[PDB]
């Protein structure tokens, strides 16, 4: 139900499983009997926290009848978030 | 074969007062209803217009025929302005703003023309 | 005659374009030859009653970046014939972009394409930034779907 | 009205959601399911002010406005073990590097 995602500096991010499965890389790491924890030695705290925020944003607003808001990305994290997203396939 | 002589200046002055009222007309929203009708699209832009609309004319050509005395009376001028408006109406059909703009430009023409100070 | 095109059906249809997104929306009408025609833009939160015709394809992009947007949760919009006197509503919203695409959008908005290759990222991402969103690429994919 | 929170303690961060009419006790039940500590054993905070069992997240300031899926609001979590009360401590996330001059 809930899976743990550790950053490179040790921060623990607990999210729903259906939320973390938004990432393709995380989906392979999980259940590959099945796994509940994933560690990333090359993604910092300020990136995973924003990554996990996207998981909440994707699952809530996918197939929604609401007004979809913009996902905000500050300039100072855009690069690191880009390869984080490229690495996680989400 | 004296078709060379120009229209009397009072007649040309009259036609240009009417066609300027029509072209400069703005609705209560400040919008120039005549702008889309100043110049026709090219045959390569909109071939469907020339397939269907068969005697094409724009305000550019209408106000041209005033300079060169092609219209010999205010009625000759009205015949093209009505043909311009009916061309837009049969191509775009009711329910379109261009149709309803041409409804109004017809009304402005007959108000502007019915101003005869004579 | 392309498969994604408007049909020259002279059947009027009233449509309400409603930009329910934070973006400046560029409506793109598909020609009778399937060629994209840009139409006047819509500020965020703005709506307009639009006259169109039955069987005409519509498409909606970000006016500044050409990012793809959604209309009634789909990518394409075709107005039916109006039932009685009732306009067809086109709700234009953002899509749920991938995390990678949203990042590309923001990096594209800050890094001018000259300095794409000056960014110290995996070189497979340089080419991702260069894959700018446009209408023809979407028409290609959306066509081959059918 | 869905509210989206980010329950943080030391270097643990829990992503979860509730409704604006959900109660602080009802978060404490969600936290109990995840961290196995009953409501009496936990203290919830909203920027140093102790949160209140029996109060709705809206009355605590958590609304659809301030706690958005893409920008959740932070709730501080502290544990009580019998007679011991640890202080509320939330370790900061890492800082981003400075912008490459390419952008600025
Ligand atoms: C407010 C606003 N906000 C955000 S978007 C927007 C908005 C939305 C719609 C319109 C106007 N509506 C349309 O163009 C609809 C939409 C699509 O279904 C196709 N279509 C059509 O009329 C086609 N017509 C047909 O299919 C038929 F009629 C056969 C059935 C077409 C394009 C003419 C082939 C608009 O309008 C303002 C923007 C806008 C849109 C298009 C154009 C370019 N045009 C093209 C040709 N046009 C015409 C000129 C004359 C004409 C000219 C001179 C003299 C006499 C004449 O009769 N007659 N008919 C014309 N269609 C001039 C300008 C310019 C400006 C603004």
Author numbering:
A (entry chain B): 17 to 48, 55 to 112
B (entry chain G): 1373 to 1490
C (entry chain C): 60 to 205
D (entry chain A): 1 to 104
From the manuscript:
To verify the modeled ternary structure, we compared top models with published crystal structures for three different PROTAC systems including an in-house ternary crystal structure of compound 11 (PROTAC 2). Another literature benchmark, 11 (PROTAC 2), demonstrated weak ternary complex binding affinity as well as less efficient degradation of SMARCA2. BSA demonstrated strong negative correlation (ρ = −0.8) with KLPT, indicating that molecules with higher ternary complex binding affinities (lower KLPT) have larger BSA.
